[PDB]
Design a binder for this molecule. Structure first.
Ligand SMILES: CCCCCCCC/C=C/CCCCCCCC(=O)OC[C@H](O)CO
Ligand SMILES: CCCCCCCC/C=C/CCCCCCCC(=O)OC[C@H](O)CO
Ligand SMILES: CCCCCCCC/C=C/CCCCCCCC(=O)OC[C@H](O)CO
Ligand SMILES: CCCCCCCC/C=C/CCCCCCCC(=O)OC[C@H](O)CO
Ligand SMILES: CCCCCCCC/C=C/CCCCCCCC(=O)OC[C@H](O)CO
Ligand SMILES: CCCCCCCC/C=C/CCCCCCCC(=O)OC[C@H](O)CO
Ligand SMILES: CCCCCCCC/C=C\CCCCCCCC(=O)OC[C@H](O)CO
Lengths: 444, 444
């Protein structure tokens, strides 16, 4: 596999061309997932509001336990990028990462469903909503090892620098997901109506199809890399070392976010609904920085593996400036046109005003988020996965949650947590920039 | 601080003398914790069975969230042993480890109680039991940062090789704990009866006293090391890197153990009660291997930091064989006298029969546990904290839980999970030994 080297004095537009080629397929992958989940929500709402509640609770808890996938994703992803940059054969990384992903899926396969329903009992779901959720989750947990394996293929491609092939798989996966769920929920074309169980099968069947395509490309075209059947315990242990802080950051971020949202829950259903609407609107801004973050791990990792440290820094700094310009635009749009963006979601005047204030406050923070996304990705590509764990969790609690806790005792307004959200985002970018300079300085 | 160097050709009895001098105070600390927890349970039983239920649920969930303490414990503990061995000034490690322990406590201080009660509203409690638990947990969470700080003092001593000073603090702490709870529960002297809240204050006040003693020794006698007020972000990040896998191993082990105990819950209350009785009996044998594990981290870390790799290996191998001899004896007691050990716990004939069968099955496994305990502690002292995470969790699921899941479909007997428990303990010892040889082999 050929590397994506960035030369220390490469012109700006030639670096961006490489960044955009990597980043656009990941942004597409992410936006297909957003569109699919929106369509899947409408399909389930054709059943009953208890069905919507069951899948709503299910998806949030599934998102939590999916933190585990970051372990096998990150270890495989980082090491393949570094090996490609060092001109080493990455085939051992691919096979051990897939086996590791399969292994860590097994506790979720054997007892993840009970754990989810257990953690659903807690949130105050009726036993009817939990009984529907158990039907929805049954096919999902039957094939959760397939989900782990396809997520690790995704990481192998991305680290290898071929983000287009997972985008191709994602297009087919997402049509299969929507077509299956639509067919099995409504019982279309002389097929039995399965209810929420049909929405679950849509996830399982699309994952099985993704896995078959990945495996077909592996056996017959040698994937990103040829298949070699040999486990290497030293690589398994290195992948665990790399991926464990990433899995932990995702799990702890979700818990921290639950705490923070509770601050808005105390303002009533309308402030809470506006926060959610503002979040899903803000996440089209999110996916851009998230895709270039993926791309930053590939670029940083490959150039780090090549010991091309000056070119690695050049790639990261150029990427960061470019993504901060793009998100200056998306942020400007959030500040200027919030009533247009909110309009498709609700018509409650009072909800429109809160969500619009949310979008405006956070739109200021979009360029900072771009900086945090890219420096985080660059540190992961260097193998420093414990650094985004420390930066993200310490920033979240010290500059967002705890200041909100104390000032909300004096100022009873949702603008308080929302204002600290944008303050913390700016602080966290400065934090990442500071640590990145010191890390790169020792490297140079 | 002087190092506990082990020379490569040191006579066996001179190595054991060093091991026993380190290990005995830790074993005392652990057994004082066992005696206190028993006395505290009897004090609460003077209130009501719902009070016992509230503290039982509380203590089990507290043990889970205490997984976090391992992050700051392990980072401070390991780096101090290595710095002492390398004859470097460990004062920076002590101060940043305390600050880090304070920091990671803060999310529990602000929302841990709700999380616990959230996580209790599930195990099948009740709003009466949960309302008592909330009274018990209120003083505990008010001073949870003090608990984190005292646990990190404990680790600094242990790594420095002075295990006697925390044993002294533990004696005073445990008397304070029992005297306070007894006073406040029974309303002794001129104090009002506070109910289960009085047991919570017993924890808080004794932790406060332990912290004051530690802090007094720091300021006036220079603790294990003098106080230097300067945070070092580079040390904080290394401590996070070291401690994160240990915290995650503890959290995941607890969850895995919950899955495994559920296999025995399906056999009824009497098979379940016998398993618990067998566990608390096995745990006086546990504390021996656990204390020598702490000592192994100190000995391995200091000799690793001294680059005295042959002496490090010699210390670990001598420690392992000696501890396996000691636990061969404790295991022989479990196999030979189970009805005597069970007698003080229950008089139900079927419970005595199951618990006795548990002790016999388990007694075989005691020398294997000693080997796993010591190799694990040695790998932690070398900074390889991700290895016990990988070895423990993979062994637990692949050789205990999953084989039990399948054979329980054919053989409906508690001997099945209990027999795989001893089988898995033996495999995990061989696993650790294999990994330890390859790690030290490269070192030599
Ligand atoms: C992973 C740590 C973050 C934890 C939470 C971050 C909150 C904001 C998330 C933005 C990502 C895109 C939003 C998608 C959120 C998916 C989780 C979820 O709520 O479940 C699906 C939901 O029901 C259907 O919108
Ligand atoms: C594999 C499909 C079955 C899973 C069901 C949908 C999963 C949502 C998308 C996950 C990867 C895409 C996110 C971009 C890759 C980031 C690294 C990763 O894959 O981790 C997953 C994430 O942390 C989890 O919370
Ligand atoms: C589980 C919760 C996660 C832990 C939350 C507690 C947070 C405490 C703060 C830590 C600061 C660490 C960030 C500082 C990073 C410094 C990295 C660095 O400077 O390294 C440069 C080096 O020269 C190149 O190799
Ligand atoms: C001194 C009071 C400290 C605050 C209250 C603690 C109570 C639990 C006892 C810990 C003794 C330490 C024995 C183990 C030595 C390692 C320290 C540790 O990490 O404890 C975390 C453990 O894994 C949890 O799940
Ligand atoms: C959630 C985590 C659960 C994981 C579930 C599957 C894990 C399977 C892997 C086992 C590898 C253990 C083998 C360790 C290999 C030895 C490491 C080594 O050789 O180290 C040499 C050198 O000293 C550098 O540290
Ligand atoms: C198979 C080879 C080793 C695999 C490596 C493991 C990967 C790490 C898994 C971590 C989460 C464990 C999830 C276990 C399922 C939920 C745990 C649980 O206990 O849920 C029940 C609840 O406690 C009722 O009280
Ligand atoms: C503050 C200083 C910054 C350093 C911070 C490092 C400590 C982070 C480590 C673990 C936090 C785990 C999160 C614990 C918070 C409780 C989570 C919770 O209560 O969530 C409720 C539940 O989600 C409702 O549905």
């Amino acid at each position: 596999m050929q590397r994506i080297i960035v030369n220390p004095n490469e012109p700006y537009l030639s670096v961006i061309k490489k960044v955009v080629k990597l980043s656009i397929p990941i942004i597409v992958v992410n936006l297909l997932y957003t569109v699919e989940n929106m369509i899947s929500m409408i399909l389930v709402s054709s059943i009953s509001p208890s069905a919507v509640a069951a899948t709503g609770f299910s998806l949030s808890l599934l998102w939590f336990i999916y933190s585990l996938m970051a372990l096998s994703y990150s270890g495989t992803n980082i090491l393949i990028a570094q090996f490609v940059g060092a001109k080493k054969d990455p085939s051992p990384i691919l096979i051990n990462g897939l086996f590791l992903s399969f292994l860590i899926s097994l506790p979720l396969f054997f007892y993840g469903k009970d754990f989810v329903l257990f953690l659903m009992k807690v949130l105050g779901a009726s036993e009817t909503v939990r009984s529907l959720a158990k039907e929805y989750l049954t096919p999902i947990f039957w094939f959760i090892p397939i989900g782990f394996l396809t997520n690790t293929f995704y990481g192998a491609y991305n680290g290898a620098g071929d983000t287009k092939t997972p985008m191709k798989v994602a297009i087919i996966m997402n049509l299969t997901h929507i077509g299956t769920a639509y067919t099995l929920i409504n019982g279309k074309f002389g097929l039995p109506k399965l209810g929420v169980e049909g929405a679950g099968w849509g996830i399982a069947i699309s994952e099985i199809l993704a896995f078959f395509i990945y495996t077909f490309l592996l056996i017959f075209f040698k994937k990103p890399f040829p298949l070699h059947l040999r486990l290497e315990p030293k690589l398994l242990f290195k992948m665990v070392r790399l991926g464990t802080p990433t899995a932990l950051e995702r799990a702890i971020t979700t818990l921290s976010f639950n705490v923070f949202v509770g601050f808005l829950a105390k303002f009533g259903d309308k402030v809470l609904a506006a926060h959610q609407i503002g979040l899903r609107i803000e996440s089209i801004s999110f996916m851009i920085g998230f895709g270039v973050m993926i791309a930053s791990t590939t670029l940083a990792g490959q150039n780090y593996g090549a010991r091309n440290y000056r070119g690695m820094v050049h790639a990261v700094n150029t990427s960061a400036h470019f993504t901060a310009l793009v998100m200056s635009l998306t942020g400007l749009i959030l500040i200027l046109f919030p009533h247009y963006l909110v309009y498709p979601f609700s018509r409650d005047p009072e909800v429109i005003e809160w969500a619009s204030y949310y979008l405006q406050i956070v739109g200021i923070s979009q360029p900072a988020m771009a900086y945090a996304s890219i420096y985080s990705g660059a540190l992961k590509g260097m193998g420093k996965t414990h650094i985004p764990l420390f930066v993200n969790i310490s920033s979240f609690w010290l500059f967002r949650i705890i200041p909100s806790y104390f000032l909300l005792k004096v100022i009873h307004s949702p603008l308080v947590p929302w204002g600290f959200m944008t303050f913390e985002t700016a602080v966290r970018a400065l934090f990442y920039y500071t640590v990145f300079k010191k890390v790169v300085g020792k490297l140079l």
